[PDB]
Structure 1
Amino acid sequence: MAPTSKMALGIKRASRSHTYHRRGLWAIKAKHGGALPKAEKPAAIAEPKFYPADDVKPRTVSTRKPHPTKLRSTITPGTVLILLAGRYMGKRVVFLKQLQSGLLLITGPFKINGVPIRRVNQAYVIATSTKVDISKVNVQKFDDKYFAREKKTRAKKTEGELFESDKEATKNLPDFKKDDQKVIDAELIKAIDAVPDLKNYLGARFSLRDGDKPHEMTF
């Protein structure tokens, strides 16, 4: 009811504004709705089909609404995630999958000789400063091109950015190891520093792509 009152109270109001910008340009959007569009060769049949456009646009928006919001309930960034503990510096992993919360798959590349990947109920993960728009979903296990090294150098920059915060913040370093040990997880304290991202996120976005399609996989 408190969110849902706000939507009402035109009706539309921005959507009454939207028309206008077309009205302002000049005289229009009956002609362009009727006159358009394409067609005419083709082969066969009914052409019952489909997609892109207009519905799809609310379904992406709609899907965006849990997505902040589930982080407001549980607090944090999103993915990409660092081993705090273990090796002082060392390397970076992305949450591709939930078997559950707690049982999680953390990821990377392998195209020639490779790199593991773990499914864990824990071992070693606390999150960083980046957000995407997935929760914690992608996977099987794929990646690869430069990227044992790149993902990893992306790790080093975050591990430097984190290591300084772990010095300023912690209770100390030894149970940041117990926090890293946990890995359900979650609520208590989240947002320290590590400023900014712009690269970190670009790197995370590629990682998501790499654990998707279409490489190395096709026959």
Structure 2
Amino acid sequence: HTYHRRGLWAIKAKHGGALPKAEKPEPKFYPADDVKPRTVSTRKPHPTKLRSTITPGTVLILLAGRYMGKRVVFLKQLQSGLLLITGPFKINGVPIRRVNQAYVIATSTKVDISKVNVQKFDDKYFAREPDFKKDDQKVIDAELIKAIDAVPDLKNYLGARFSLRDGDKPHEMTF
């Protein structure tokens, strides 16, 4: 509940802000109606907040899509705000993908991914426009299968889909 504009300072931004007078900047057709021109908007929409239970290397259950119920490891949160996930593709067959923060559930099981390089993966990599994608996927699992093998039973856990069964109350389950 912090008041950013609590004080009339405005100078911690532009300390050397004592500057001079501003300098203000044929149609070939006239539209017959006074339409205010559309310029690009100068508003910064304050990027989305990551859920505090999702941290790099934590496990996610997918809630919708063609991979509903897939137990998947979380890697990174992209600039657009979509989480970066991998299956990995060897165990459950889920490739590298970006998923919305909704449609996933953050479990309390974690994996260390510190020595894993996820840098070239970003929003531009998923631009709607494959052999090298197979290589990138191939070189990101072998860096992660071993850490999955480090924890007992984590491999068979990641290779199974989550499902609700008789008598299961999602609002009581710990995960």
TM-score by length of 2: 0.29
- Once the two structures are overlaid, the 10-residue window that deviates more, 130-139 or 24-33, is 24-33
Greater relative contact order (Cα < 8 A, sep 6+): 1
Alignment match, 1:22: 5
Counterparts of 1:37-48 in structure 2, within 5 Å, are none
Q: Which runs of 5+ in 1 are unaligned?
A: 1-17, 151-173
Secondary structure at the counterpart of residue 172 of structure 2 = coil
Q: Deviations over 1:100-135 (max 9, x none)?
A: 483211113458997543223435211112123458
Cα separation, partners in 2 of 1:72 and 1:114, compared to 1, 3 Å: closer
Between Structure 1 and Structure 2, the one with more helix by share is 1
Q: Deviations over 1:3-27 (max 9, x none)?
A: xxxxxxxxxxxxxxx9999999999
Secondary structure at the counterpart of residue 76 of structure 2 = strand
- Once the two structures are overlaid, the 10-residue window that deviates more, 194-203 or 183-192, is 183-192
TM-score by length of 1: 0.24
Alignment partners' CA distance in 2, 1:96 and 1:123: 16
- Aligned-residue Cα RMSD (Å) equals 19.7
Cα separation, partners in 2 of 1:38 and 1:216, compared to 1, 3 Å: farther
Q: Is the 8 A contact 1:80 1:93 kept in 2?
A: yes
Secondary structure at the counterpart of residue 93 of structure 1 = strand
Between Structure 1 and Structure 2, the one with more strand by share is 2
Could you tell me how far 1:83 is from its partner in structure 2? 1.4
Cα separation, partners in 2 of 1:22 and 1:177, compared to 1, 3 Å: closer
Q: Which runs of 5+ in 2 are unaligned?
A: none
Q: Deviations over 1:140-167 (max 9, x none)?
A: 69999999999xxxxxxxxxxxxxxxxx
Q: How many residues align?
A: 175
Cα separation, partners in 2 of 1:138 and 1:203, compared to 1, 3 Å: farther
Aligned identity (percent) is 100
